[PDB]
Design a protein around this ligand. Sequence first.
Ligand SMILES: O=C(O)[C@@H](O)Cc1ccccc1
Ligand SMILES: [Zn+2]
Length: 307
Amino acid sequence: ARSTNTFNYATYHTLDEIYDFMDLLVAEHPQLVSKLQIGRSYEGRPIYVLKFSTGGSNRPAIWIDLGIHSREWITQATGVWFAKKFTEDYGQDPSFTAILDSMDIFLEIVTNPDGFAFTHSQNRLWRKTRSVTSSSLCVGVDANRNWDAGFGKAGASSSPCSETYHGKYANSEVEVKSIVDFVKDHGNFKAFLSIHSYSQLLLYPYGYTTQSIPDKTELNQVAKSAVEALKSLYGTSYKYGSIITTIYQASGGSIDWSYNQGIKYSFTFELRDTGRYGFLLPASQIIPTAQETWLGVLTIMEHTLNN
Ligand SMILES: O=C(O)[C@@H](O)Cc1ccccc1
Ligand SMILES: [Zn+2]
Protein backbone atom coordinates (compact mmCIF):
# COMPACT_ATOMS: atom_id res chain seq x y z
CA ALA A 1 0.00 0.00 0.00
CA ARG A 2 1.58 3.21 -1.34
CA SER A 3 -1.30 5.39 -0.05
CA THR A 4 -3.82 4.93 2.75
CA ASN A 5 -6.24 4.96 -0.22
CA THR A 6 -4.73 1.77 -1.62
CA PHE A 7 -4.38 -0.06 1.72
CA ASN A 8 -6.68 -3.11 1.90
CA TYR A 9 -9.02 -2.58 4.86
CA ALA A 10 -10.82 -5.85 4.09
CA THR A 11 -7.98 -8.13 5.03
CA TYR A 12 -5.89 -8.85 8.14
CA HIS A 13 -2.40 -7.39 8.23
CA THR A 14 0.95 -7.95 9.91
CA LEU A 15 2.59 -5.65 12.42
CA ASP A 16 4.87 -4.00 9.80
CA GLU A 17 1.97 -3.31 7.49
CA ILE A 18 0.11 -1.59 10.31
CA TYR A 19 3.16 0.42 11.42
CA ASP A 20 3.78 1.46 7.78
CA PHE A 21 0.10 2.47 7.52
CA MET A 22 0.58 4.86 10.48
CA ASP A 23 3.35 6.71 8.70
CA LEU A 24 1.32 6.93 5.49
CA LEU A 25 -1.56 8.50 7.42
CA VAL A 26 0.59 11.11 9.19
CA ALA A 27 2.24 11.98 5.89
CA GLU A 28 -1.18 12.53 4.26
CA HIS A 29 -2.81 14.50 7.11
CA PRO A 30 0.00 16.23 8.90
CA GLN A 31 -2.25 18.90 10.28
CA LEU A 32 -4.61 16.44 11.93
CA VAL A 33 -2.63 13.42 12.93
CA SER A 34 0.61 12.80 14.79
CA LYS A 35 2.33 9.54 15.76
CA LEU A 36 3.56 9.39 19.38
CA GLN A 37 5.81 6.61 20.78
CA ILE A 38 4.74 6.09 24.41
CA GLY A 39 7.09 3.19 25.19
CA ARG A 40 8.72 0.02 23.98
CA SER A 41 7.38 -3.51 24.39
CA TYR A 42 9.10 -6.30 26.30
CA GLU A 43 10.75 -7.44 23.03
CA GLY A 44 11.63 -3.81 22.23
CA ARG A 45 9.05 -2.96 19.55
CA PRO A 46 7.87 0.65 19.69
CA ILE A 47 4.42 1.29 21.18
CA TYR A 48 2.62 3.90 19.09
CA VAL A 49 -0.40 6.05 19.65
CA LEU A 50 -2.02 8.20 16.90
CA LYS A 51 -3.13 11.63 18.14
CA PHE A 52 -5.98 13.29 16.17
CA SER A 53 -6.31 17.02 16.96
CA THR A 54 -7.29 20.33 15.39
CA GLY A 55 -5.14 22.27 17.89
CA GLY A 56 -5.45 23.83 21.27
CA SER A 57 -3.42 22.95 24.30
CA ASN A 58 -4.28 19.89 26.30
CA ARG A 59 -7.86 19.73 25.16
CA PRO A 60 -10.05 17.18 26.92
CA ALA A 61 -9.41 13.86 25.21
CA ILE A 62 -10.74 10.46 24.38
CA TRP A 63 -8.56 7.34 24.68
CA ILE A 64 -9.22 4.28 22.49
CA ASP A 65 -7.07 1.13 22.63
CA LEU A 66 -7.34 -2.07 20.57
CA GLY A 67 -5.41 -5.35 20.55
CA ILE A 68 -4.51 -5.66 24.27
CA HIS A 69 -5.28 -9.42 23.70
CA SER A 70 -3.30 -10.26 20.57
CA ARG A 71 -5.52 -12.98 19.03
CA GLU A 72 -8.54 -10.64 18.81
CA TRP A 73 -7.53 -9.68 15.26
CA ILE A 74 -10.87 -7.98 14.51
CA THR A 75 -9.83 -5.24 16.98
CA GLN A 76 -6.53 -4.19 15.29
CA ALA A 77 -8.36 -4.34 11.93
CA THR A 78 -11.14 -2.05 13.28
CA GLY A 79 -8.46 0.30 14.71
CA VAL A 80 -6.86 0.79 11.26
CA TRP A 81 -10.30 1.46 9.75
CA PHE A 82 -11.09 3.98 12.55
CA ALA A 83 -7.82 5.89 11.91
CA LYS A 84 -8.72 6.30 8.26
CA LYS A 85 -12.35 7.15 9.04
CA PHE A 86 -11.33 9.99 11.38
CA THR A 87 -9.42 11.68 8.55
CA GLU A 88 -12.30 11.14 6.12
CA ASP A 89 -15.11 12.42 8.32
CA TYR A 90 -13.50 15.55 9.67
CA GLY A 91 -15.24 18.39 7.79
CA GLN A 92 -17.86 16.06 6.26
CA ASP A 93 -19.80 14.71 9.23
CA PRO A 94 -21.16 17.55 11.35
CA SER A 95 -21.13 15.55 14.49
CA PHE A 96 -17.65 14.14 14.24
CA THR A 97 -16.38 17.59 13.08
CA ALA A 98 -17.81 19.22 16.24
CA ILE A 99 -16.05 16.63 18.38
CA LEU A 100 -12.59 17.07 16.85
CA ASP A 101 -13.01 20.85 16.92
CA SER A 102 -13.09 20.66 20.72
CA MET A 103 -11.45 17.38 21.75
CA ASP A 104 -8.40 15.28 20.94
CA ILE A 105 -8.58 11.54 20.18
CA PHE A 106 -5.72 9.18 21.12
CA LEU A 107 -5.83 5.79 19.31
CA GLU A 108 -3.62 2.81 20.19
CA ILE A 109 -4.11 0.28 17.40
CA VAL A 110 -1.69 -2.42 18.60
CA THR A 111 -1.56 -2.33 22.39
CA ASN A 112 0.34 -5.62 22.59
CA PRO A 113 2.78 -5.73 19.67
CA ASP A 114 4.83 -8.72 20.88
CA GLY A 115 1.78 -10.93 21.24
CA PHE A 116 0.51 -9.71 17.83
CA ALA A 117 3.77 -10.67 16.11
CA PHE A 118 3.56 -14.09 17.86
CA THR A 119 0.00 -14.67 16.55
CA HIS A 120 1.40 -14.25 13.05
CA SER A 121 4.55 -16.36 13.46
CA GLN A 122 3.73 -19.17 15.88
CA ASN A 123 0.39 -19.28 17.65
CA ARG A 124 -2.66 -17.59 16.18
CA LEU A 125 -4.52 -17.89 19.50
CA TRP A 126 -1.90 -16.27 21.76
CA ARG A 127 -3.57 -13.86 24.23
CA LYS A 128 -0.88 -12.60 26.62
CA THR A 129 2.22 -10.45 26.43
CA ARG A 130 5.58 -12.17 25.82
CA SER A 131 7.35 -11.27 29.08
CA VAL A 132 9.45 -14.03 30.60
CA THR A 133 8.16 -15.09 34.00
CA SER A 134 11.16 -15.74 36.23
CA SER A 135 10.28 -18.90 38.16
CA SER A 136 8.44 -20.52 35.24
CA LEU A 137 8.62 -21.99 31.76
CA CYS A 138 5.39 -20.23 30.89
CA VAL A 139 5.58 -16.91 29.05
CA GLY A 140 3.43 -13.82 29.33
CA VAL A 141 0.85 -11.94 31.36
CA ASP A 142 -2.80 -11.15 30.56
CA ALA A 143 -2.37 -7.37 30.13
CA ASN A 144 -6.10 -6.96 30.91
CA ARG A 145 -5.58 -8.40 34.41
CA ASN A 146 -2.44 -6.30 35.19
CA TRP A 147 -4.00 -2.91 36.05
CA ASP A 148 -4.20 -1.48 39.52
CA ALA A 149 -7.95 -2.06 40.04
CA GLY A 150 -8.63 -4.87 42.51
CA PHE A 151 -5.28 -6.26 41.35
CA GLY A 152 -4.84 -9.94 42.19
CA LYS A 153 -8.37 -10.40 43.47
CA ALA A 154 -10.74 -13.02 42.15
CA GLY A 155 -11.16 -12.89 38.42
CA ALA A 156 -7.40 -13.38 37.64
CA SER A 157 -4.91 -16.26 37.96
CA SER A 158 -1.77 -16.47 40.07
CA SER A 159 -0.33 -19.21 37.87
CA PRO A 160 2.17 -18.02 35.23
CA CYS A 161 0.89 -20.67 32.82
CA SER A 162 -2.73 -19.46 33.03
CA GLU A 163 -4.26 -17.49 30.12
CA THR A 164 -5.45 -15.00 32.76
CA TYR A 165 -2.20 -14.68 34.68
CA HIS A 166 -2.11 -11.23 36.36
CA GLY A 167 1.71 -10.90 36.57
CA LYS A 168 3.95 -10.17 39.53
CA TYR A 169 2.43 -6.85 40.52
CA ALA A 170 0.08 -4.20 39.19
CA ASN A 171 1.63 -2.54 36.12
CA SER A 172 4.49 -5.01 35.81
CA GLU A 173 3.89 -5.14 32.03
CA VAL A 174 5.58 -2.29 30.16
CA GLU A 175 2.70 -2.30 27.70
CA VAL A 176 0.38 -1.40 30.61
CA LYS A 177 2.66 0.98 32.48
CA SER A 178 3.24 2.92 29.24
CA ILE A 179 -0.48 3.72 29.04
CA VAL A 180 -0.82 4.42 32.76
CA ASP A 181 2.03 6.99 32.72
CA PHE A 182 0.76 8.69 29.59
CA VAL A 183 -2.83 9.06 30.77
CA LYS A 184 -1.73 10.17 34.29
CA ASP A 185 0.66 12.72 32.80
CA HIS A 186 -2.02 14.09 30.38
CA GLY A 187 -4.58 14.41 33.16
CA ASN A 188 -7.36 15.59 30.80
CA PHE A 189 -8.87 12.35 29.54
CA LYS A 190 -12.70 12.37 29.61
CA ALA A 191 -13.39 8.95 28.02
CA PHE A 192 -11.47 5.66 27.96
CA LEU A 193 -12.53 2.87 25.59
CA SER A 194 -10.82 -0.53 25.40
CA ILE A 195 -11.80 -2.86 22.53
CA HIS A 196 -11.82 -6.63 22.58
CA SER A 197 -13.57 -9.57 20.87
CA TYR A 198 -15.73 -11.62 20.81
CA SER A 199 -19.27 -11.76 22.32
CA GLN A 200 -21.06 -8.57 21.24
CA LEU A 201 -21.16 -6.76 24.56
CA LEU A 202 -20.81 -3.14 25.73
CA LEU A 203 -19.51 -3.11 29.32
CA TYR A 204 -18.95 -0.48 32.03
CA PRO A 205 -17.33 -0.81 35.46
CA TYR A 206 -16.83 -2.72 37.60
CA GLY A 207 -15.42 -6.21 37.02
CA TYR A 208 -13.49 -6.65 40.31
CA THR A 209 -16.21 -5.70 42.80
CA THR A 210 -19.98 -6.14 43.14
CA GLN A 211 -20.17 -2.48 44.24
CA SER A 212 -22.19 -0.26 41.84
CA ILE A 213 -20.48 2.79 40.36
CA PRO A 214 -22.01 6.18 41.37
CA ASP A 215 -22.61 6.96 37.67
CA LYS A 216 -24.50 3.78 36.89
CA THR A 217 -27.72 5.42 35.63
CA GLU A 218 -25.92 7.69 33.19
CA LEU A 219 -23.46 5.07 31.92
CA ASN A 220 -26.31 2.61 31.49
CA GLN A 221 -28.30 5.12 29.44
CA VAL A 222 -25.23 5.89 27.31
CA ALA A 223 -24.63 2.17 26.74
CA LYS A 224 -28.24 1.65 25.74
CA SER A 225 -28.02 4.49 23.22
CA ALA A 226 -24.73 3.26 21.82
CA VAL A 227 -26.02 -0.29 21.29
CA GLU A 228 -29.13 1.06 19.57
CA ALA A 229 -26.92 3.08 17.21
CA LEU A 230 -24.61 0.16 16.46
CA LYS A 231 -27.56 -2.18 15.78
CA SER A 232 -29.04 0.24 13.26
CA LEU A 233 -26.75 -0.67 10.36
CA TYR A 234 -26.75 -4.48 10.15
CA GLY A 235 -28.96 -5.53 13.06
CA THR A 236 -26.02 -6.77 15.19
CA SER A 237 -27.33 -7.34 18.70
CA TYR A 238 -25.29 -6.36 21.72
CA LYS A 239 -26.00 -6.75 25.43
CA TYR A 240 -24.76 -4.16 27.94
CA GLY A 241 -24.19 -3.84 31.68
CA SER A 242 -21.39 -3.83 34.24
CA ILE A 243 -18.61 -6.38 33.69
CA ILE A 244 -19.29 -8.45 36.79
CA THR A 245 -23.02 -8.77 36.10
CA THR A 246 -22.70 -9.35 32.37
CA ILE A 247 -19.59 -11.38 31.55
CA TYR A 248 -17.83 -12.50 34.77
CA GLN A 249 -15.81 -11.29 37.75
CA ALA A 250 -12.47 -10.02 36.31
CA SER A 251 -9.82 -8.18 38.39
CA GLY A 252 -7.11 -5.77 37.18
CA GLY A 253 -9.01 -4.67 34.04
CA SER A 254 -8.28 -1.38 32.37
CA ILE A 255 -11.67 0.28 32.48
CA ASP A 256 -11.94 -0.32 36.27
CA TRP A 257 -8.62 1.48 36.60
CA SER A 258 -9.58 4.39 34.30
CA TYR A 259 -12.90 4.92 36.06
CA ASN A 260 -11.09 4.98 39.45
CA GLN A 261 -8.85 7.72 38.04
CA GLY A 262 -12.02 9.86 37.49
CA ILE A 263 -12.46 9.14 33.71
CA LYS A 264 -16.17 8.75 33.84
CA TYR A 265 -16.90 7.43 30.37
CA SER A 266 -15.02 4.14 30.68
CA PHE A 267 -16.30 1.35 28.47
CA THR A 268 -15.20 -1.91 26.86
CA PHE A 269 -16.64 -3.19 23.58
CA GLU A 270 -16.52 -6.98 22.87
CA LEU A 271 -16.89 -7.16 19.05
CA ARG A 272 -18.39 -9.77 16.72
CA ASP A 273 -19.29 -12.56 16.68
CA THR A 274 -21.06 -14.70 19.26
CA GLY A 275 -19.10 -17.89 18.62
CA ARG A 276 -19.63 -19.16 15.09
CA TYR A 277 -16.10 -18.04 14.16
CA GLY A 278 -14.97 -16.48 17.45
CA PHE A 279 -11.40 -15.15 17.22
CA LEU A 280 -11.06 -16.33 13.61
CA LEU A 281 -13.67 -13.95 12.20
CA PRO A 282 -13.65 -13.98 8.38
CA ALA A 283 -11.91 -11.05 6.63
CA SER A 284 -15.28 -10.44 4.95
CA GLN A 285 -16.68 -9.16 8.28
CA ILE A 286 -13.98 -6.58 8.95
CA ILE A 287 -15.65 -3.56 7.29
CA PRO A 288 -19.20 -4.21 8.48
CA THR A 289 -17.90 -4.71 12.01
CA ALA A 290 -15.86 -1.50 11.86
CA GLN A 291 -18.71 0.53 10.43
CA GLU A 292 -21.29 -0.50 13.00
CA THR A 293 -18.76 -0.20 15.91
CA TRP A 294 -18.04 3.38 14.76
CA LEU A 295 -21.73 4.31 15.31
CA GLY A 296 -21.51 2.96 18.85
CA VAL A 297 -18.23 4.83 19.59
CA LEU A 298 -19.44 8.06 18.00
CA THR A 299 -22.53 7.96 20.27
CA ILE A 300 -20.33 7.81 23.35
CA MET A 301 -18.09 10.62 22.04
CA GLU A 302 -21.12 12.83 21.48
CA HIS A 303 -22.26 12.36 25.03
CA THR A 304 -18.78 13.14 26.28
CA LEU A 305 -18.57 16.38 24.36
CA ASN A 306 -21.83 17.49 25.90
CA ASN A 307 -21.52 16.22 29.51
O1 LIG B 1 -11.48 -10.97 29.94
C1 LIG B 1 -11.35 -9.84 29.42
O2 LIG B 1 -10.35 -9.09 29.42
C2 LIG B 1 -12.48 -9.09 28.71
O3 LIG B 1 -12.90 -9.66 27.73
C3 LIG B 1 -13.59 -8.70 29.70
C4 LIG B 1 -13.15 -7.48 30.45
C5 LIG B 1 -13.22 -6.15 30.01
C6 LIG B 1 -12.80 -5.05 30.77
C7 LIG B 1 -12.31 -5.26 32.07
C8 LIG B 1 -12.24 -6.57 32.55
C9 LIG B 1 -12.64 -7.66 31.76
ZN1 LIG C 1 -9.84 -9.54 25.03
